[PDB]
């Protein structure tokens, strides 16, 4: 059972690393989109 557990527990670190990088990319994309949208709103407000 312990060997089963040890073999099962691997391939996990890759899951966490890939998800962490994916979440970093998600946050960067969301921040960029929000900043661009806010800049568009700034342009609209200056026009107004």
């Amino acid at each position: 059972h312990l060997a089963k557990k040890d073999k099962l527990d691997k391939e996990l670190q890759k899951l966490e690393d890939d998800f962490a990088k994916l979440k970093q990319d998600h946050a960067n994309d969301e921040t960029k989109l929000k900043t661009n949208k806010r800049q568009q709103q700034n342009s609209l407000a200056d026009n107004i």
């Binding site: 059972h1 089963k4 099962l8 527990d9 966490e16 998800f19 994916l22 994309d29």
Partner: protein, 53 residues
């Protein structure tokens, strides 16, 4: 009987534990997929909002 039943119960618990543990890789993949789906929805939202503005 002690020896046999104790080994049997030990294996029962080990197999139940293996059942429980052979889900964490699936859960990590599901978590990554759900994060991707949330990012997809929110990115569509952000792009649509910026385009409308």
């Amino acid at each position: 009987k002690e020896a046999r039943a104790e080994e049997g119960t030990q294996q029962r618990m080990y197999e139940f534990e293996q059942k429980q543990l052979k889900e964490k890789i699936n859960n990590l993949k599901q978590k990554t997929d759900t994060e991707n789906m949330v990012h997809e929805q929110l990115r569509n939202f952000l792009i649509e909002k910026e385009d409308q503005i």
